[PDB]
Design a protein around this nucleic acid. Structure first.
Ligand SMILES: [K+]
Ligand SMILES: [K+]
Ligand SMILES: [K+]
Ligand SMILES: [K+]
Ligand SMILES: [Mg+2]
Ligand SMILES: [Mg+2]
Ligand SMILES: [Mg+2]
Ligand SMILES: [Mg+2]
Ligand SMILES: [Mg+2]
Ligand SMILES: [Mg+2]
Ligand SMILES: [Mg+2]
Ligand SMILES: [Mg+2]
Ligand SMILES: [Mg+2]
Ligand SMILES: [Mg+2]
Ligand SMILES: [Mg+2]
Ligand SMILES: [Mg+2]
Ligand SMILES: [Mg+2]
Ligand SMILES: [Mg+2]
Ligand SMILES: [Mg+2]
Ligand SMILES: [Mg+2]
Lengths: 394, 59, 64, 60, 114, 50, 71, 32, 166, 420
RNA sequence: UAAUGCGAUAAUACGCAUGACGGUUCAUUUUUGCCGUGUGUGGUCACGGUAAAACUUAAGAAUCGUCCA
RNA sequence: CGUUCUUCAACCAACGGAAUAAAGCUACGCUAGGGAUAACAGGCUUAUUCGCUCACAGAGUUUUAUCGACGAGCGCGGUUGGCACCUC
RNA sequence: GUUUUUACUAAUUAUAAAAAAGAAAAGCUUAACUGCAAUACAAACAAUUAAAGCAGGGGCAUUGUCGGCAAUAAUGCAUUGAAGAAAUA
RNA sequence: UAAGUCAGACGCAAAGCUACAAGGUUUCGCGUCAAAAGGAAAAAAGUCCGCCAGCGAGGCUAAGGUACAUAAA
RNA sequence: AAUAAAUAAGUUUAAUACCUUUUGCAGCAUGGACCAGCGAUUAAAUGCCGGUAAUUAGCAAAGUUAAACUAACGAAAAAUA
């Protein structure tokens, strides 16, 4: 705290005490959801909007170690308890605090009540977007992704935010611009607009400053948003991938390869693409990424080779994960059928493990199967060569 | 293998001990030499037992 | 213990406090080993604590 | 005057058995039990002071 | 003999530099949170406005001090703000600041020191 | 503090907290430690036979 | 040295909430103490009234209230 | 280990060492 | 452990904190030539047992003498030591004196019972801390320094050692 | 302070001026000024040797006031124990009470839902009706009012008791206040054997010129009773009561307006006043509408035929209000605390009968609950499922079928929880 | 915080001007000593503190000097 | 003549101030009590006193023959003191 | 006591108080009031200490402050006597 | 309990007074005696271990001991 | 301090009276030679606080003494019509 006059009395008149720092330290020191609950129980009467905002981010940090399992019960209980404070302080938050509230609750895959989201949106709807200026770059990237993840669709909110952020787009970091680009591609009322053109242009000179994950997202969003390269993003993004094809993680390499393939720019690079997958197939390939890999390889037209039976390994990996939504299972089966490989006739066929796992899973979830679903599976089963109404050999 | 509980046995008498140390023994409910109690393994219990390591045996 | 060597009250024999014998030294060594052992055990307990605390029955708590 | 700093923490949790002074409360405790597990613990703590009257009432 | 602090939602601040005088109006919800600036007018804006129409000598002139007060009055009136509390500091005793405050009071804005 | 009269400070603080709790409801309504509290057991080890 | 409201409420409506809390606190204290800790006097006479409030100073003459008529 | 040790001791009839049907197999308490 | 209550941790009125002299580790300053005071002191002011810092060295000379123990020396003792050192070393020797007796001590005459106030000044003393350097020498050789050390050791109640600059 | 020791609150000038006086009656003032059940018990215990029937009558009446303070919950243990001890004194002095004292005694014990023993209740009744009620003449209006309602709440249905009481009170009906007459009318409606007696007609006629003096609460009850007692409106009370309601539609509290509105709808006198009726409900919905009155509002609006409008979704808010009452969630906001909202009183278990009635009424409204993501009736049924899960023991075959019919009617029959 | 800062008419329209060198003022708890409490045959013990006192190597910021290597 | 309110004054400075005021002698003494408390003796302490060792400066003048010091340490319980532990 | 101005930031028996504060200079004033007071510090008791707030009549400002003095010492129970006013008899 | 008590003592650890003396004196933290038998050090109020409802020719230990006195290498 | 606990009856081990007064007494502090008899919180009136009962008490004898009690805010609406 200082009494010296200055240009920004808004951020200089804030009162900071030792007691507030004491509570914030306890929140950060908590190492588990069980410990964090006890910290909040002791401090019930001494929680302020800053403490509530920080706690929501703590839930995001705590759940990162629980990579495999779903959201734990104590995390859900904490989220419900915190929401009681959010409603109480709905009109006492800053734009920076609201930014980190939505991100924290969105990372736990929780949905905020529509009445509460409307109240929190007043930070950017009131004062003609003056408060947007107070927000820094880190706040802006969380506001776009946080509200987008919540499913909040309000034209006035998004129109005002876009207008107040347009001047600063060229001077944001590359990753932040990529985040905004992905959000725009997901909103129909922002396609082919000045905001979209400005965002694409600002990214043109910042292509080389993107991180692998953000680089893949930008290329995916750019391809859908701008089929015709009127901004030059696609050419630059493709060039960077070619130069650094082997320098990116597997999941990023799969995403870019699929996007390039669907752009009808396939090249004889399959030999280079296959080797990374077999080297790292049992890891760095969740169900979503495996589907993208299958679509890209099948669309490109690579044929199974004796040296590297990629399809055989992929089928085994798919079976391991199954042993999921029926739609994903149906889509995977169709892609395998389009591959042109047999499963039933041969004793040891590349696709045999997948279909065998599929039959076992369907038997346990026969209630979910519908007439259309059964017909689609039957077509896939007929295509691969299993139509006798008998279980797979394996 | 998690440690779920601790066993505390009294070794020394109440005579000649400071009054702020007798309170700890009374909270653990130890009254006689060679008497044993079972307590839950919690951080608050361990802190108290660290103030009287010369009066008891812990396992 | 008494260190004072003056006065008419003979807390110690003439010459002051006497030095420890071999048995007394051995006695004091063992008293310290027990104390050090207790602190070592508390270290093991802290490194192997379970997530959920066990609930133990008590008749007096049950009544009230 | 002051030998410990801070707010007193939670009391330790100690497993205890019934004492001879409360032998006359056994019948009341049986009535207050609300489940088989609780009644099992009540009898176990009072094992050294069980009498034929207590065994008969538990079965009832 | 320092007086106790009193919390107010709307406060007026002045920043007097070598070259210009800056006036801000900030709204607060609690002392522990940052405020929201609702008005931001300095003699730099007045100089650019008057110079086009009426020549002025420099930003720190009586003409610009009155112009800044007038612009502040319009913004507060549009936002339905009629009463503010002035934050007193070393810069508050500057001659340029005092002229602006006097003009604001005559225009109709109620400025309170305590 | 010099006086030997017993202090009434704990009584004065309790009256203040009780008044606030009576009139102002709390925001939280659950405690995780209470929710997952398990059944009471006699001991954590097998019994020693005679 | 600062005093912070209960729920960080700095609005001007907090004053009335504080007034109610003051009344409640006195009721809590009287309940805990018991009936035999008397908090008001009960004399065999009434205290004089001056300027609309209760006064501890006596009048020159003591009289029963309302036991006299005009003239 | 506590469960795997309580069972072994439980599977021992020490009261059967004072029943006159005993041999040198009713005292082999430790190692079956 | 620190013996304070929770209100003291937050609103203590002891804003300007000074370490007590009895336990302060700062080296004592060089003696000055101010006149001796006529104000009675307390007995603690003439005693200090905390050791010297672990960075003490010679400041001016090449050789010196240090004390390995704490002690309280009177003015009479210092004068006898000064004459012994001057005679032993030479007339053409450089000597630095780093100590001086400045703390008054009181005493009462024989035949006086306890009470009726404190006594009158009798002599002056100075505290000595372990490892402190008492004298420094220059324009001499090492053998001469040893001779000075042996000359004064019988005249002091504490063990003494030699210090050299390198 | 300065007068008393540390921690003792300072004197209240209002109380001090009551206790400091030249006149006697100290014990009566002490019991009258008691602020809690425990305090009153201590006063009676320390004054046992000097208690008299007048002291016992006041003590039982005080139980009514203490209960009112402790609202939002059922009768507490200390109140029950205090009532039990007072009954022993009533038996002791049962032969020494006057008509006025008996009237106060019954009223206080009735307000606490305490059932006087039949033997003691008979004795108290005998005192009032002894000597053919010739002693009832020396009683004021309040004494008569409390006699009628106090015994009716107890359930005393002795025909001879009521016959004698009615005969003595009959000549004084024209000279009673409007509120007193309204209380008498309520008792007459509840007693079937007096439905067609001349006493009922005399009461209705006596109330004709005193309609304007009825309080909003008594006025609402009088209109309810008159509808059942005189469906033909021969006395003209219904016409006069309806006219006053129309003139002063917005001048009454919410609870009284809802009760009168429901009575009009069941009388098939609906008029295009729904627009005026809807706005007060939405304006004050979080307060002045407990569970019972919320059901009354739904029945009146549904019977009248009001349909959901975009500007004012009355049915949507009522579902949220119903869910709030069932769950019992409270709010710490300063406005809610100072406004004394009913929802912040706490949690009160409601009969399953009301839950079934509300569910049926919502189903008859014609709005959906399940299909839409945000439907007007979504919050109520979601709260209902949570509440029922904790009280499955009370569910039987008939109750389950009744809810199942309501669930199907609204459009939730897939065996899945409500979205909200 | 270049709508900055400083000024010898000192007012601010005019003067110096945000780099570079030099000299001053402000991390494995830097790690040792030391202090406090407890226990103690007077130390082969435990924990904590030093934003109270001695003690290391930096990097940066604020002036100041300067035709600049 | 009495009561209440607004106020003040004197001795209380032995300053919680009251029996209105108010000094001495007793070796002519008397009674009730205390080793809770002094004088002789014992006890504890050792500043002081006394003795020894280191120190070998300075006188003697080759000798530490003899005399002898600043200063420090230790001992003794015989000098002058301190305390109030035993006996009124 | 309270308003205005600024090339000033001291002193006390003693003391690192204090910059939206003080001191000095200029102007107007008597709150160095009447009747009450939540809640606390301290404390064997007696007394001693701080004080939001309500009504009346005022002062300087023009909606803030004033129930004496930077703070920590400058004192004395009850009784008896005396004075101003008021109510009885 | 509207009772008794308002003569306290010493050990370890600090400070004032004395002479960094006293089994001295004045405060302060803990313990013991006072009002506490039993065991160890020679006798042993205040040091170390340890708190006696009664009886018994059972067993395990604490402080301290284990060529004789005097139980145990 | 003239006894105690044991014993193969030879002996072995443990063991400084009581009262009063004291920080502390085997006390080199106080009182008692021994036996029998005598020898010290009692009664009245009044007040306060517990316990146990009477259910106002005393006279008188359809009428009198003593004590005790004697207004505080008339605040509840529980009708599956
Ligand atoms: K001990
Ligand atoms: K005196
Ligand atoms: K004598
Ligand atoms: K004899
Ligand atoms: Mg001796
Ligand atoms: Mg041992
Ligand atoms: Mg005599
Ligand atoms: Mg003596
Ligand atoms: Mg003494
Ligand atoms: Mg007092
Ligand atoms: Mg005013
Ligand atoms: Mg003042
Ligand atoms: Mg005394
Ligand atoms: Mg005394
Ligand atoms: Mg002594
Ligand atoms: Mg005694
Ligand atoms: Mg053994
Ligand atoms: Mg032997
Ligand atoms: Mg004595
Ligand atoms: Mg004699």
């Amino acid at each position: 705290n200082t009494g010296v006059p200055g240009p920004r009395p808004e951020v200089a008149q804030k009162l900071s005490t030792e007691y507030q720092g004491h509570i914030l330290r306890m929140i950060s020191l908590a190492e588990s959801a069980s410990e964090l609950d006890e910290v909040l129980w002791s401090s019930k009467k001494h929680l302020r909007p800053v403490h509530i905002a920080r706690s929501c981010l703590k839930l995001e940090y705590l759940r990162t170690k629980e990579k495999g399992r779903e959201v734990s019960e104590p995390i859900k209980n904490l989220a419900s308890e915190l929401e009681n404070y959010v409603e109480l302080y709905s009109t006492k938050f800053t734009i920076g605090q609201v930014s980190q509230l939505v991100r924290g609750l969105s990372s736990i895959r929780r949905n905020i009540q529509p009445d509460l989201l409307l109240k929190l949106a007043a930070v950017v709807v009131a004062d003609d977007g003056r408060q947007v200026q107070l927000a820094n770059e880190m706040d802006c990237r969380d506001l776009f992704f946080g509200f987008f993840s919540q499913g909040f669709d309000n034209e006035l909110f998004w129109k005002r935010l876009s207008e107040s952020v347009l001047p600063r787009l060229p001077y944001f970091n590359a990753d932040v611009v990529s985040t905004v680009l992905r959000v725009v591609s997901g909103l129909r009322f922002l396609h082919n607009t000045e905001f979209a053109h400005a965002t694409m242009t600002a990214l043109v000179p910042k292509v080389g400053d993107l991180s692998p994950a953000r680089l893949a997202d930008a290329f995916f969003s750019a391809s859908l948003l701008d089929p015709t390269d009127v901004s030059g993003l696609n050419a630059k993004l493709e060039e960077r991938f070619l130069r650094e094809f082997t320098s990116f993680p597997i999941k990023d390499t799969v995403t870019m390869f699929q996007t390039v393939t669907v752009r009808r720019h396939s090249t004889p690079e399959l030999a280079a693409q296959v080797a990374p997958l077999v080297a790292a197939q049992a890891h760095q390939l969740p169900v979503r990424h495996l589907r993208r890999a299958l679509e890209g390889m099948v669309t490109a037209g690579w044929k199974d080779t004796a040296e590297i039976p990629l399809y055989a390994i992929l089928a085994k990996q798919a079976a391991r994960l199954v042993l999921t939504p029926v739609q994903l299972l149906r889509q995977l089966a169709r892609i395998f059928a389009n591959t042109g490989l047999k499963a039933g006739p041969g004793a040891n066929q590349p696709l045999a493990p997948y279909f065998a796992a599929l039959q076992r899973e369907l038997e346990g979830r026969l209630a979910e199967l519908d007439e259309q679903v059964t017909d689609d599976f039957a077509e896939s089963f007929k295509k691969v060569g299993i139509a006798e109404g008998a279980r797979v050999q394996i | 293998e998690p440690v779920r509980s601790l066993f505390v046995t009294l070794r020394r008498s109440y005579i000649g001990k400071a009054w702020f140390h007798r309170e700890i023994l009374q909270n653990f409910r130890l009254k006689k030499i060679r008497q044993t109690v079972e307590v839950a393994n919690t951080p608050s219990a361990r802190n108290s037992l660290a103030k009287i390591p010369h009066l008891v045996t812990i396992e | 213990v008494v260190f004072k060597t003056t006065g008419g009250k003979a807390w110690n024999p003439p010459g002051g406090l006497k030095p420890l014998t071999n048995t007394q030294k051995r006695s004091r060594k063992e008293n310290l080993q027990i104390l050090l052992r207790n602190l070592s055990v508390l270290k093991l307990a802290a490194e192997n604590q379970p997530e959920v605390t066990v609930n133990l029955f008590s008749p007096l708590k049950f009544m009230h | 005057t002051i030998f410990n700093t801070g707010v007193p923490g939670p009391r330790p949790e100690v497993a205890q058995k019934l004492s001879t002074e409360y032998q006359g409360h056994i019948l009341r405790m049986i009535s207050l039990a609300e489940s088989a597990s609780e009644l099992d613990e009540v009898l176990w703590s009072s094992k050294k002071h069980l009498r034929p009257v207590h065994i008969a009432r538990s079965c009832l | 003999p320092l007086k106790p602090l009193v919390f107010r939602p709307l406060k007026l601040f002045f920043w007097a530099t070598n070259r210009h005088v800056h006036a801000k109006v900030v709204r607060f919800s609690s002392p522990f949170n940052e405020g929201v600036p609702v008005v931001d007018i300095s003699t730099f804006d007045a100089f650019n406005k008057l110079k086009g129409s009426a020549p002025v000598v420099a930003p720190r002139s009586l003409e610009c001090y009155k112009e800044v007060a007038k612009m502040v009055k319009e913004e507060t009136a549009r936002q339905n703000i009629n009463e503010v509390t002035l934050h007193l500091n070393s810069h508050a005793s500057d001659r340029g600041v005092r002229e602006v405050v006097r003009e604001l009071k005559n225009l109709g804005l109620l400025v309170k020191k305590v | 503090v010099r006086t030997k009269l017993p202090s009434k400070r704990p009584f004065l603080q309790t009256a203040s907290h009780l008044a606030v709790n009576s009139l102002v409801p709390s925001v939280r309504t659950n405690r995780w430690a209470d929710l997952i509290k398990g059944p009471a057991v006699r001991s954590c080890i097998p019994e020693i036979p005679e | 040295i600062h005093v912070v409201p209960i729920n960080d409420d700095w609005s001007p409506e907090y004053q009335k909430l504080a007034d109610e809390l003051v009344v409640r606190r006195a009721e809590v204290k009287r309940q805990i103490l018991g009936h035999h800790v008397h908090t008001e006097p009960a004399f065999h006479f009434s205290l004089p009234q001056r300027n609309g409030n209760m006064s501890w100073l006596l009048n020159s003459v003591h009289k029963f209230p309302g036991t006299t008529t005009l003239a | 280990x506590x469960x795997x040790x309580x069972x072994x001791x439980x599977x021992x009839x020490x009261x059967x060492x004072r029943x006159x049907x005993x041999x040198x197999x009713x005292x082999x308490x430790x190692x079956x | 452990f620190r013996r304070r209550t929770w209100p003291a941790v937050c609103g203590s009125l002891h804003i300007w904190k000074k370490m007590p002299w009895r336990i302060d580790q700062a080296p004592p300053p060089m003696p000055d030539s101010k006149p001796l005071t006529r104000l009675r002191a307390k007995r603690y002011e003439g005693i200090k047992k905390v050791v010297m810092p672990n960075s003490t060295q010679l400041q001016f000379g090449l050789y010196g003498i240090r004390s390995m123990e704490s002690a309280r020396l009177k003015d009479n003792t210092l004068e006898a030591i000064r004459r012994t050192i001057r005679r032993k070393i030479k007339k053409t020797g450089r000597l630095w004196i780093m100590i001086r007796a400045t703390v008054p001590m009181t005493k009462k005459p024989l035949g006086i019972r306890m009470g009726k106030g404190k006594g009158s000044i009798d002599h002056y003393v100075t505290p000595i801390r372990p490892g402190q350097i008492l004298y420094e020498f220059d324009r001499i050789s090492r053998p001469i320094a040893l001779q000075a050390l042996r000359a004064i050791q019988p005249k002091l109640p504490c063990r003494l050692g030699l210090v050299e600059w390198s």
